């Protein structure tokens, strides 16, 4: 096949042009995102039941929905939580590879069938089903500096003016508003209501009656009278549109005729739908917009379009309003992608430089410069054909495969040049001979590398997807590299190279090139002499190989395991947790302290703090909060102390002094969608209907038992809230009946006053908005205020709550959790240093096995994936080894020679492990993929050496030792000039300390160490293996 | 999947027109075979439980989990889950001048769980230090509680 | 029994807000009538799977579904694949003349 | 696969059953499927031997 | 027309505009493909040009 294209250079050029055009089209059309879809598809059902506690929401909402979640396909599991804020959130996690749209529609349809079973208030608020597996591309904050506007005003302006245009922007998959529109608010005064002998029920009824839309017909509508000439539509009562109209709503008229309008007993004002969450941006009122990218959309282009649309908005904004970007990771993504592209380009340049240094022929150096970009473009085209996208994993896969591509080009070009220099043949016949020598080896190497890299794609779950990214990328790059080396590279060698003499090795050259040449023949002679001396004492080097293997096992077992390096993305989060029962003001004070610290002590690094009072992770209440701290540009933060890790450690140390609050600063997970992968997630399930208290006791016992094992488990804590005091009101039905007051009226008055009620809608500036009736804050603060509220009995006399009710304080859960439809409690933990997560989970299972009767357990989150993919690696790599052995036996036509090639893996693995250990890195995904790349390249070198030696023994009459020595002499130069090029290409990643330095270092350090040791050891261990194997079996 | 999606898309138009009792009993749309894949029976080898108890246990502790298993298209319970059964005596109702309407109204009023709001709820007053959930009438959980309805 | 402007603001805009995130969408049209009817048509690119497009439109619509007035829910919001032309018209007459 | 998943779920449930409760399988066509497939495979092996 | 009043095409007109817009690209790509195929088959850059 190489001979076909050697005689047809134009056909090979046409093939290369086609590949380049396809790659360019793919680059133009390929989506770009930081990461692909890694986490399993998940669908979240969210409902709100205003004024309701956790138990009320769970009993009336959560349990019904969970009982009606049946018949949905590919559901891995289902969890739910009901808060004291009145919010239920149910996450259904489906198996990987499930169509998210189909799962989402099935979940919606089962909820639509369950909807009639829910409270009317829950139905009125609406139950929303979303896909929660995705994260936010961007978060655009809107702030007011003049102080004229508040959070509600800014949120309403964003909803009315900004949301639509952002949604219409190209590539904007989803837009969610951090806040709510305006809503009419009826702040009831209990004393005024008692004075006029009214109750909140009357206000609700009047508002419903006097704010509605009525269908009214048409003048002349059909069936029509015989000569009708005019047809028109009749307009009747329409919804109110202003606070003034609501003010005049009439609730009663006095005997005298003075009118008891609505404003008499309440304050009418436009406010927020919910006041639970307060937002500030550097201590200024703010609202937000979270923007999620669409499918197949370019993240960079989408961010640019969003910014352009916001700039278009800017001139029309009300004076004093400003756009800010509290959370913008797109710059980090851009820098990472640009750094990878720069790495690839510099790799090509280093290949050119090394090729010129060794061969000292410009036309020879041109050939790899044409070959490698063609393979890269073909790889892009193949990725587009498979539906992949340009992301961090794919780009680093290309970076890793660059070494294989460089080796493929260098082998062909150097072999052709060596044949020309030795036999003196002209370029065409020299190329023919070289390809006749190396083509079978190249095909066998293609098969071997396919066997090595394909199995990654068959891991299960999130790790399966992460490894499949690299697997597809590298396998496609390798296949295109081999195809190019068989099609185009020989044609380029035959057409571009110029004749070289039968004996010229360059030693006649005058300056640095001549010195380097002569030094190189001297070094090659010394290397051949050393190898020959080695082959006479093979036993010592066999025991040395055993020592190397033992050291490899030691380093592997003693190396920690990780998932993905933590990156300095320019943003981190501080979570604030106040004691139970804390109010919004105390959390606001703590958040103000945190913001002041960040903007004063860390003023050089931090540019903005987005404080969110009322919402924090693993909670939703007044006693929780979260601040999203954004750092200045990496170029403005030079040093190791000005990075996210150091900043977070300093902030945590400073905040540990804060009293009456737990404040903890931390960096983002590498993949926020998967969240943390640090430890284990454990679910303790109530299986026998024990109750909340018994489950709490079981959880406490398990936590104590885990704490009694410091050396195996660390920071085993509950991922939930503890029980808190609650105000219980016991309404005596007998007393209420005796005094002539209905229980329904009492409950309605209490709920409307102290929790608020949603009555109906109105039209504000041509937008439908909600109407809420609630007590004024002054009269719904303390238990004593219960005495300020009166209910009208059937007799028309107002009776107090104390007359027909009593009060006390009890304990209740502010957040109730369920797993797979049963009550549960979530425990988060992690293995102690030096302990694997598997044995930590085994110990947790052993501890849980001793818990009281009726208490079960389950694994969720990352633990579920770990259980799924626990045993895949050994079997997959056993299959890989078997297939590699079979391919090598096919290549060499021998059942024993393949062992000489396969004995080379430890040579690179040991160096990779040593490099990782010395730099204090972990066994993460990047390290493993780099390990596979190093193993593949070392196997390539060994395969070529053994092929040359065997061909020398068979086609010629040379003996074992002579053939091996000649083979190593022939293969020394390509090995060295590939290792040097790849090592120098990866050095920038090794020494990188800027943005994205985590993944860069993880990819670079292991690769560099593995290449160094693979080269150095293999160049004189492979001949030993070949000689020993040939002697043993022959 | 698409067939079920379209069928229930059309069914959602009829749902508002169906009687409230039908909606409250739960309308189901399913895609499954006409024949049972299998039958998982449950007995008691000690003889302590009756048919009602076994059926309630299967409905409450095993039915939902099986229904959520992938590949399960339908689950038919050979029994029924427990429920609070009020067996009315017409003679007693007439003696006290009562009607099943009155019984239903009393059950609805005195067996309910109401959202009662919060102490120190947002918007709060300045200087508010306490925030708590107000608990009120809760659903009854025993036959004794139901028998005490006035 | 709703005006064209009122139904457009209360219904048409609300629905149209959440329909901009659907895949393979070429363009969108909508008409609001004084009879209270709202008709929105989303035209997708050629070769798009119609069933998947309809499923995605349902998924986006259910988000805005609660925001519509209770009367809209009572009558119901329908999402279905549509065509703008009649394949044929089948008329029925009474030759005798005994049926109006 | 569905039968295997159902049996796995029942195994999860079983440890928490009340005293005396027992699961039985009064109707299951799956064992016939397994035995039939096994018999055909056995026939193939015996055919190779013959 | 006054400022703020734009226009667009729909239905048949959208398809007609798209076809007219993408015709020249189609011609160029087809010519390039034929040229490359001729060069590949006849092993020359002169025969495809002629
Ligand atoms: O995951 C979502 C977004 O969380 C964030 C938020 C900010 C950043 Cl910068 C980032 Cl990165 C992430 C969670 N989210 C929390 C509250 C929000 N509801 C709200 N309501 C009123 C005001 C606000 C606030 F504070 F965001 F303006 N939010 C709705 C759901």
Curated annotation (Swiss-Prot), chain B:
Localization annotation: Cell inner membrane
Inactivation phenotype: Loss of susceptibility to contact-dependent growth inhibition (CDI); inhibiting cells still contact the target.
Query: Taxonomically, which superkingdom?
Result: Bacteria
Induction context: Positively regulated by MarA, Rob and SoxS transcriptional regulators (at protein level).
Q: Give a short account of what the protein does.
A: AcrA-AcrB-AcrZ-TolC is a drug efflux protein complex with broad substrate specificity that uses the proton motive force to export substrates. (Microbial infection) Involved in contact-dependent growth inhibition (CDI), acts downstream of BamA, the receptor for CDI. Its role in CDI is independent of the AcrA-AcrB-TolC efflux pump complex.
| Similarity annotation | Belongs to the resistance-nodulation-cell division (RND) (TC 2.A.6) family.
Instruction: Provide the assembly information.
Output: Homotrimer, with large domains that extend into the periplasm, interacts with AcrA and TolC. AcrA may be required to stably link this protein and TolC. Interacts with AcrZ. Part of the AcrA-AcrB-AcrZ-TolC efflux pump.
Quote the protein name from its UniProt record.
Multidrug efflux pump subunit AcrB
Origin species, per record, is Escherichia coli (strain K12)
